Write an enzyme that holds these catalytic residues in place. Structure first.
Site, PDB file in Angstrom:
ATOM      1  N   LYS A   1       3.369 -10.018 -10.220  1.00 18.57           N
ATOM      2  CA  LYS A   1       3.990  -9.299 -11.328  1.00 18.57           C
ATOM      3  C   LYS A   1       3.420  -9.704 -12.689  1.00 18.57           C
ATOM      4  O   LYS A   1       3.376  -8.890 -13.613  1.00 18.57           O
ATOM      5  CB  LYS A   1       5.505  -9.527 -11.321  1.00 18.57           C
ATOM      6  CG  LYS A   1       6.241  -8.837 -10.177  1.00 18.57           C
ATOM      7  CD  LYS A   1       6.366  -7.339 -10.423  1.00 18.57           C
ATOM      8  CE  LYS A   1       7.291  -6.674  -9.411  1.00 18.57           C
ATOM      9  NZ  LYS A   1       6.688  -6.577  -8.052  1.00 18.57           N
TER      10      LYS A   1
ATOM     11  N   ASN B   1       7.632 -11.688   0.831  1.00 22.87           N
ATOM     12  CA  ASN B   1       7.385 -12.072  -0.555  1.00 22.87           C
ATOM     13  C   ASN B   1       7.687 -13.565  -0.719  1.00 22.87           C
ATOM     14  O   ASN B   1       8.841 -13.972  -0.602  1.00 22.87           O
ATOM     15  CB  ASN B   1       8.247 -11.231  -1.499  1.00 22.87           C
ATOM     16  CG  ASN B   1       7.896 -11.437  -2.963  1.00 22.87           C
ATOM     17  OD1 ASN B   1       6.807 -11.906  -3.301  1.00 22.87           O
ATOM     18  ND2 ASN B   1       8.821 -11.069  -3.843  1.00 22.87           N
TER      19      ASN B   1
ATOM     20  N   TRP C   1       9.612  -4.896   2.963  1.00 21.16           N
ATOM     21  CA  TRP C   1       9.290  -5.909   1.968  1.00 21.16           C
ATOM     22  C   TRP C   1      10.436  -6.915   1.967  1.00 21.16           C
ATOM     23  O   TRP C   1      11.469  -6.678   1.349  1.00 21.16           O
ATOM     24  CB  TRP C   1       9.100  -5.258   0.592  1.00 21.16           C
ATOM     25  CG  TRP C   1       8.857  -6.190  -0.585  1.00 21.16           C
ATOM     26  CD1 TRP C   1       9.472  -7.384  -0.845  1.00 21.16           C
ATOM     27  CD2 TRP C   1       7.936  -5.976  -1.663  1.00 21.16           C
ATOM     28  NE1 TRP C   1       8.990  -7.922  -2.011  1.00 21.16           N
ATOM     29  CE2 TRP C   1       8.045  -7.080  -2.534  1.00 21.16           C
ATOM     30  CE3 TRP C   1       7.029  -4.959  -1.975  1.00 21.16           C
ATOM     31  CZ2 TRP C   1       7.281  -7.196  -3.693  1.00 21.16           C
ATOM     32  CZ3 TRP C   1       6.270  -5.075  -3.126  1.00 21.16           C
ATOM     33  CH2 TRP C   1       6.404  -6.186  -3.974  1.00 21.16           C
TER      34      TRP C   1
ATOM     35  N   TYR D   1      14.374   0.617  -4.110  1.00 23.13           N
ATOM     36  CA  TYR D   1      13.780  -0.049  -2.952  1.00 23.13           C
ATOM     37  C   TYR D   1      14.806  -0.801  -2.103  1.00 23.13           C
ATOM     38  O   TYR D   1      14.438  -1.544  -1.193  1.00 23.13           O
ATOM     39  CB  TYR D   1      12.674  -1.006  -3.409  1.00 23.13           C
ATOM     40  CG  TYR D   1      13.093  -2.000  -4.465  1.00 23.13           C
ATOM     41  CD1 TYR D   1      13.750  -3.173  -4.124  1.00 23.13           C
ATOM     42  CD2 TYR D   1      12.820  -1.768  -5.806  1.00 23.13           C
ATOM     43  CE1 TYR D   1      14.128  -4.086  -5.088  1.00 23.13           C
ATOM     44  CE2 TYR D   1      13.193  -2.673  -6.778  1.00 23.13           C
ATOM     45  CZ  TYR D   1      13.847  -3.829  -6.415  1.00 23.13           C
ATOM     46  OH  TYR D   1      14.218  -4.728  -7.385  1.00 23.13           O
TER      47      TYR D   1
ATOM     48  N   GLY E   1       4.043 -10.695  -4.492  1.00 22.71           N
ATOM     49  CA  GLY E   1       4.672  -9.734  -5.381  1.00 22.71           C
ATOM     50  C   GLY E   1       5.758 -10.327  -6.251  1.00 22.71           C
ATOM     51  O   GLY E   1       6.676  -9.615  -6.666  1.00 22.71           O
TER      52      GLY E   1
ATOM     53  N   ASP F   1      11.234  -2.194 -10.368  1.00 19.24           N
ATOM     54  CA  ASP F   1      11.703  -2.836 -11.599  1.00 19.24           C
ATOM     55  C   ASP F   1      11.179  -2.160 -12.863  1.00 19.24           C
ATOM     56  O   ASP F   1      10.561  -2.810 -13.709  1.00 19.24           O
ATOM     57  CB  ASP F   1      11.309  -4.316 -11.623  1.00 19.24           C
ATOM     58  CG  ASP F   1      11.972  -5.114 -10.522  1.00 19.24           C
ATOM     59  OD1 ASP F   1      12.905  -4.591  -9.876  1.00 19.24           O
ATOM     60  OD2 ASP F   1      11.568  -6.276 -10.317  1.00 19.24           O
TER      61      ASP F   1
END
Ligand SMILES: CNC(=O)C[C@@H]1[C@H](O)[C@H](O)[C@@H](CO)N1CCCc1ccc(F)cc1
Length: 663
Positions: free
Chosen positions: A163, A369, A334, A279, A132, A240
């Site tokens: 992304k 991540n 995450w 988040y 991610g 984002d």
């Protein structure tokens, strides 16, 4: 040693030979993936009924009806037994059986098994990796390698969401993948299934989504396409973004629509996950009520992701209790480590730590991540897999060492050396740091303080530094030529080059400290200056990304030590011999006299002052001069402005002060 460490383990002293002759029981019933692993381990092809019985199967199968009571009643749980008479490989489910074989493969050493009783299961339901990050997405071959790595370490989840994949994010999330990419994704899902990994395809539509029927239908159409490619788990990311896409009510309604009209309508869809706009606690606005809206409106089966108290943070008991109270369910963590897309000139190869070890029941899942360097990320991934499976017995350093020995057994010690001094992120906006070079930190701190104060440093500390630099060079050169994991070496090579230069420079500077005559000192001094220039070259020609270009290594302890030691001994030399040697520690072809000591920096085609007159090493065409008189020589002269390709060598007139030139 077993990774992840099982929940229950009983070891004896008996050594069982991998039987020449074996009788397989339940080969037709058990998980085909698990059976394939087993048969591969049994090249001792004597397979008659006269041999040692080997029972494999899932709970309810005829093969393992006897051991029904020993099999843990947890999802992905299993029971494993090895003794003189029989081997048992009984899972609570098909994935449990597969995981029994992965443990069994670790027990097989020198073609001989230990006498063991194992009852095992995961403490966290969903464990794995979310691709991610921002930056170059993982190559297809990297992803194939990753999936097989996950299966071996009992990670059951891979969430695809680069992304910078245009068909994942805006605007082309509305478009199906081209035939090439589609065929590749189809293969990934297949390989994921063979390794018992849930391939979760994520979509990132938030930035330009309209809350109407058209975009809704297009999203479902996209999901339907991925389903035809074999995808059976899905995600919607709203991280984002700004604008209408941040609406919690609309987000929850969309996800619930996806759930009720697609996820439940299909016969075999597993995970459905969403990443909220808020988040982490720090980005959560208390003036509103975004999180409590999601928690109440979003269907309970749907997962909600969370990075902790900050964008980059470790998970604590108080932190997860905070989010859980609001989203009305256990958070799906995450974890933003070792992702380095905000410190792209650093490799983050240190151990995994900081996350609370007693809160397994308080999270729905835990994914990491990673860096855009896939192989290099296996150190952290391997550790998260261990942590996520059995957090109660998670051993930070032992697992870090086990990871390295697994990834590169032919040069494990060299990789440890390299990794120990490549774990800190350096200064960054998130204020997230990791320990680095702690082994030698105390000897470096004492040596430098004694040297600066003109006191006598301990010989032991001096020799430790010498040993370290020597070891670094060995490790650097051996890693460069290693052919076991070529993809890994490709990733880290630029840093390994810079790593060796750092070590070489360190050796030469220590010789300047030992220096007892002028001629020898000057030879070393000139060598150091040349090495500085070499490090500059690598910093300007490797890893030239738009955000943090270049290559930094051993930044926390070692580079400051060498820089400060070099500066100090040069000062002492100038004092003693009435000289004027330059004590600069970083080469800079340009100059800036005037802030008096603020150093210049070259980044791509930009020359800038670290947040007045600048002289370049030559005449270039100018692009612009951003800020927050021009000239080719000191004779003639001429919140931002352009240069229009005019020749420039001199500039004249602090958050930014950057000259851009043409290449
Ligand atoms: C759970 N979602 C995220 O973590 C979103 C993103 C990406 O996943 C990224 O890989 C990660 C760490 O760099 N997050 C950074 C976010 C900082 C950021 C700061 C300022 C901005 F303007 C934009 C993004």
């Amino acid at each position: 040693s077993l990774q992840p460490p099982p929940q229950q383990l009983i070891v004896q002293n008996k050594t069982i030979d991998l039987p020449a002759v074996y009788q397989l029981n339940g080969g037709e019933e058990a998980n085909p993936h698990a059976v394939k692993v087993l048969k591969e381990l049994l090249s001792g092809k004597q397979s008659s009924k006269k041999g040692m019985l080997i029972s494999i199967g899932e709970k309810g199968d005829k093969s393992v009806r006897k051991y029904s009571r020993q099999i843990p009643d947890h999802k992905e749980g299993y029971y494993l037994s090895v003794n003189e008479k029989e081997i048992v490989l009984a899972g609570n489910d098909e994935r449990g059986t597969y995981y029994a074989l992965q443990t069994f493969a670790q027990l097989l050493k020198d073609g001989k098994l230990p006498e063991v009783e194992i009852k095992d299961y995961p403490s966290v339901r969903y464990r794995g990796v979310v691709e991610g990050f921002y930056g170059t997405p993982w190559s297809h071959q990297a992803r194939l390698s990753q999936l097989k790595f996950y299966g071996k370490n009992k990670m059951n989840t891979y969430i695809y969401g680069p992304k910078d994949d245009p068909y994942h994010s805006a605007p082309n999330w509305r478009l199906p993948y081209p035939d090439k990419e589609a065929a590749q994704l189809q293969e990934l899902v297949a390989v994921a299934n063979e390794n018992e990994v849930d391939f979760v395809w994520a979509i990132h539509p938030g930035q330009d989504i309209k809350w109407n029927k058209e975009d809704r239908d297009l999203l479902l159409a996209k999901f339907e396409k991925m389903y035809q490619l074999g995808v059976r788990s899905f995600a919607v990311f709203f991280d984002d973004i700004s604008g209408e896409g941040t609406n919690p009510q609309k987000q929850a309604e969309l996800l619930n629509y996806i759930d009720e009209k697609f996820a439940q309508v299909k016969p075999d869809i597993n995970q459905l996950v969403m990443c909220p706009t808020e988040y982490n606690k720090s980005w959560s606005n208390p003036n509103g009520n975004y999180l409590t809206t999601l928690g109440d409106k979003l269907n309970p089966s749907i997962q909600i992701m969370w990075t902790g108290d900050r964008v980059i943070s470790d998970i604590t008991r108080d932190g997860i209790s905070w989010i859980n109270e609001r989203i009305k369910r256990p958070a799906y963590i995450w974890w933003n480590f070792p992702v380095s897309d905000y410190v792209r000139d650093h490799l983050l190869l240190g151990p995994v730590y900081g996350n609370d070890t007693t809160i397994a029941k308080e999270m729905s899942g835990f994914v990491t991540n990673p860096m855009e360097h896939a192989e290099s990320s296996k150190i952290a991934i391997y550790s998260v897999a261990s942590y996520a499976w059995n957090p109660a017995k998670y051993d930070t350093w032992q697992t870090w060492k086990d990871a390295i020995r697994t990834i590169l057994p032919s040069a494990a010690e060299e990789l440890e050396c390299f990794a120990m001094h490549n774990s800190d992120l350096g200064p960054n906006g998130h204020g997230y740091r990791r320990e680095e070079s702690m082994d030698i930190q105390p000897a470096a701190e004492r040596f430098l303080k004694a040297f600066k104060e003109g006191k006598n440093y301990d010989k032991a500390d001096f020799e430790t530094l010498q040993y370290t630099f020597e070891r670094m060079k060995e490790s650097a050169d051996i890693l460069l030529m290693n052919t076991e994991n070529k993809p890994l070496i490709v990733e880290i090579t630029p840093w390994v080059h810079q790593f060796k230069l750092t070590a070489e420079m360190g050796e030469e500077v220590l010789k300047m400290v030992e220096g007892r005559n002028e001629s020898y000192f000057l030879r070393k001094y000139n060598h150091v200056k040349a090495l500085q220039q070499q490090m500059f070259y690598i910093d300007q020609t490797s890893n030239q990304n738009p955000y943090q270009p270049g290559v930094k290594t051993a930044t926390r302890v070692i580079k400051p030590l060498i820089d400060r030691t070099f500066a100090t001994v040069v000062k002492f030399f100038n004092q003693k011999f009435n000289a004027h040697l330059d004590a600069t520690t970083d080469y800079m072809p340009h100059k800036m006299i005037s802030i008096k000591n603020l150093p210049l920096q070259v980044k791509a085609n930009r020359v800038l002052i670290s947040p007045v007159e600048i002289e370049l090493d030559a005449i270039y065409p100018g692009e612009n001069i951003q800020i927050n008189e021009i000239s080719t020589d000191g004779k003639e002269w001429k919140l931002s402005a352009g240069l229009q390709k005019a020749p420039v060598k001199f500039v004249r007139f602090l958050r930014q002060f950057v000259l851009t030139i043409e290449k």
